Design a protein around this ligand. Structure first.
Ligand SMILES: CC(=O)N[C@@H]1[C@@H](O)[C@H](O)[C@@H](CO)O[C@H]1O
Ligand SMILES: *[C@@H]1O[C@H](CO)[C@@H](O)[C@H](O)[C@H]1NC(C)=O
Lengths: 41, 49
């Protein structure tokens, strides 16, 4: 969705359409986001 | 009856169900044509004598 705000998640409604079912059969109990860095310790 | 559907099925959607979970619209597996389904015409028969 188009957003012109950088914080304080805007109110209103917006549905999340399914994008992939991923027929996987693993167990997941620990999650960790993978974030890029602006490397330019 | 397989009339041409006016429903705007989203790309991920396949079917459309009635309040009683009876399918009232279907997605053709071979093509993205949306077909709405109406029950075969029926009704009572009364004899006037
Ligand atoms: C000859 C041929 O390719 N027939 C169908 C095609 O029309 C359809 O788009 C495709 C997708 O399921 O399956 C196959
Ligand atoms: C969670 O996944 C692990 C795999 O490391 C497995 O040993 C464990 O039995 C799983 N637990 C459940 C509740 O499925």
């Amino acid at each position: 969705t188009p957003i012109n705000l950088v914080r304080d998640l805007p109110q209103g409604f917006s549905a999340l359409e399914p994008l992939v079912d991923l027929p996987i059969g693993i167990n997941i109990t620990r999650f960790q986001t993978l974030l890029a860095l602006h490397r330019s310790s | 009856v397989l009339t041409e559907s006016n429903k705007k099925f989203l790309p991920f959607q396949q079917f459309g169900r009635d309040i009683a979970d009876t399918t009232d619209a279907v997605r053709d597996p071979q093509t993205l044509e949306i077909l709405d389904i109406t029950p075969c015409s029926f009704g009572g028969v009364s004899v006037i004598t």
